[PDB]
């Protein structure tokens, strides 16, 4: 998975 929280 690809997960991002900016």
Author numbering: 1 to 6
Direct quotes from the study:
Here, we identify an evolutionarily conserved hexapeptide sequence as the major aggregation-prone region (APR) of gastrointestinal peptides of the glucagon family: xFxxWL. We determine nine polymorphic crystal structures of the APR segments of glucagon-like peptides 1 and 2, and exendin and its derivatives. We propose that the pH-dependent changes of the protonation states of glutamate/aspartate residues of APRs initiate switching between the amyloid and the folded, monomeric forms of the hormones. Our results highlight the dual role of short aggregation core motifs in reversible amyloid formation and receptor binding.
